[PDB]
Amino acid sequence: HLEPPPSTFQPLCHPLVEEVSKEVDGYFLQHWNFPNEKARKKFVAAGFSRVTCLYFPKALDDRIHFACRLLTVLFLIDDLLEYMSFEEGSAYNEKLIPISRGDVLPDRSIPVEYIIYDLWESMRAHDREMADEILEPVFLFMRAHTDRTRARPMGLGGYLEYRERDVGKELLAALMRFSMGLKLSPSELQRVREIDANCSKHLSVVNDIYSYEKELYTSKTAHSEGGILCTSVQILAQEADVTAEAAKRVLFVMCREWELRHQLLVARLSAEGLETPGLAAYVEGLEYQMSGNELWSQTTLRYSV
Amino acid sequence: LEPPPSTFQPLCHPLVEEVSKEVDGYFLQHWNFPNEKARKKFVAAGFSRVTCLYFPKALDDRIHFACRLLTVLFLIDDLLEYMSFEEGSAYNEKLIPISRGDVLPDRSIPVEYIIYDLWESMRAHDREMADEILEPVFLFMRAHTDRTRARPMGLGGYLEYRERDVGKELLAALMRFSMGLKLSPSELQRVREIDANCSKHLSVVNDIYSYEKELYTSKTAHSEGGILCTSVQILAQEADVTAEAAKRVLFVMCREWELRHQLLVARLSAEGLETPGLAAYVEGLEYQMSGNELWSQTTLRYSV
Ligand SMILES: [Mg+2]
Ligand SMILES: [Mg+2]
Ligand SMILES: [Mg+2]
Ligand SMILES: [Mg+2]
C-alpha cells in the first residue's frame, strides 16, 4: 500500500460527473472497437470521464462533455500505440492529425477516424477560436509518444523536460481554458510559464507513481518500442539504487514540494501587480489539475489492476 | 529541518574525551594555524568526536590513529578549497609518496612530517592493515581535484563519484584497522553491495547538513577548489526546487537506504553468508551512518 504525504490541495470534481460519464462512456461503447467484453468493462472501470471532471471541475456545463470525449479517445489511442513500433505509431497519429484539423474526411468504417473528426467538428461548432488553440498542443502531445528520445537514456532533469509534452501539459492547459471559456492574453500566458512548468512536473510524477505497475507490465508483454518503460520511478530507482516502491515514496515527497512552489509562485505573481482575475482563475485551475490527477490515480481500476 | 525517524542508534567511543584532547593538542602544537580564531574553530569542529562516532567499537590503543588521520584530512581539504585544481593536485601528490614512506618529509613543513609520522606510527602498530588504507586514502585525495566537479552531473553519476569524495573505502579500511577486524577478500566481496548503499547514505546525510557552509565556501573561496559539488544543489536543479526542498526529499531517500541496508544484511544472513567478521563489519557500517548523522546534526562546523 502507498500512503500519500499531507497535501493542502483540495481536489474538486465537476457536479455533472455522473451524467457526462454515462453519456460519454456510452458513446464510446457504441462506436469504439473493443477486442472483447473484458476490455469494455475495463474501459468503464477506468473512469476516463471521471478524471476529466476532476481535472476541470469548474468547466462550463455545456463544454465539459467535449473535454471528456477528447481525453477518452486520447487514452484509447495511447494504449494502442503501446503495441506498435515508433514507425507504426507515428503513422497512426499523423493520419488522425489532418482529420483533427478537419482538412481530411474520415473513414466511416474506421471508428477512431470519425470519432476524432466528429469531436473536433463539434468543438469548433461550439467555440471555433478556443478549440483551434487546442489543436497544436494535442498534436504535440501525440507526437511525443513516438519521440525516439524514449529509446535513449535520460536523467531526472531531461526526463521532466520531455514529459511536459508526453503528459500533455500544454494540451491540458488549452483544454481547461476552452472548457471554462477562460480567455487569456499572450502577455498573461507568458506571465505564468514558470507556474506551468512546475505544475507539469507534478502531473507527470504523480501519474508515474500510480501508473508504474501498469507500465511495468506493458514493458514486458507489449512491443519493445511502443511499450518501452519511460518513467521517473524507474529513473530515480536506477540513479539512487533503490526499489521502485522506494522511489515512489521519495517522488511523492518531491511532489509536495512542487505544490509548495506552486503556492509561492502564485503568491509572488500576486505580490507583483501581475495577477489578473483571469490569471487567478487559471492558476486555481492548475491546482485542480494537480490534485484532481492525484485523486483519480489513487482510485481508478486502471492502475490498481 | 526535522529529520525523519530512523532505527539506527548512534554510539560513541568511550574514550572520546581523552583522545580528543590528545589529538587536538597534537595539531594545535604542530599544524600551522593562521590565527587564534582558526584554532578555536578547529576545536569547535570536533574532528575526534566524529571519528569516535564513526568507529565507537574501535580498539582503545588504535582509536587515536583514526582520529589523527581523519583530522589531518579535514585540514588538508579545507586548504584545497582556496587552491585551484592544479594547485590542489600538486599539494596532494606531494604527500602521497610521503604517506607510503618512500619520501622523507620536509621537517620545516608541518603537513609533511605530520602525514609521515602518522602513517609510520600506524605501520608500526599494524603493518598489514595500515597498508590497506593507503590507496583508499589516495583515491579520496585525488577525488578532490577531479575535474569532474566542474562539469554537469546527474544524481546517479554524482553518487558514484562521491563514493570517492566521501572516502567510503578509506573509512571502511580505517574502521577495520581501528577494530583489528580482519576480513578475507572473498568476505569483502560479499558486502560490496552493502558498502555502495552505505556510501550513498554517508554522502547525502553530510550533504544535507554541510550545504550552508559549502555554499558560503563556493561564494568566498577559490572558484575551483571551493566549487559546489553536492546532491542538494543537484537535486534542486533537476527538480527546479529550492535547496531546503531538496534536503527534505534527500532525507527521505536516506531512510530508504537504511531500509535497504537492513534488507541486504538480512538477505546476507538468510543465506549462510554472514560470517562473525562480516557481522561486526556491517554493524560498524551502521555506526558510521548513525554517527555521521549525529555529528553533522550538532557540530559547530556546519551550524556556524
Ligand atoms: Mg506513456
Ligand atoms: Mg503513466
Ligand atoms: Mg568537499
Ligand atoms: Mg559536505
Swiss-Prot record, chain B:
Pathway: Sesquiterpene biosynthesis; aristolochene biosynthesis; aristolochene from farnesyl diphosphate: step 1/1. It catalyses: (2E,6E)-farnesyl diphosphate = (+)-aristolochene + diphosphate. Mg(2+) 3 binds at residues 206, 210, 214. It comes from the Eukaryota. (2E,6E)-farnesyl diphosphate binds at residues 301-302. GO terms for biological process: isoprenoid biosynthetic process. Mg(2+) 2 binds at residue 77. Catalyzes the cyclization of trans,trans-farnesyl diphosphate (FPP) to the bicyclic sesquiterpene aristolochene. Produces germacrene A as an enzyme-bound intermediate that is not released by the enzyme, but is further cyclized to produce aristolochene. Aristolochene is the likely parent compound for a number of sesquiterpenoid toxins produced by filamentous fungi. Belongs to the terpene synthase family. This is Aristolochene synthase. It comes from Aspergillus terreus. The gene is Ari1.
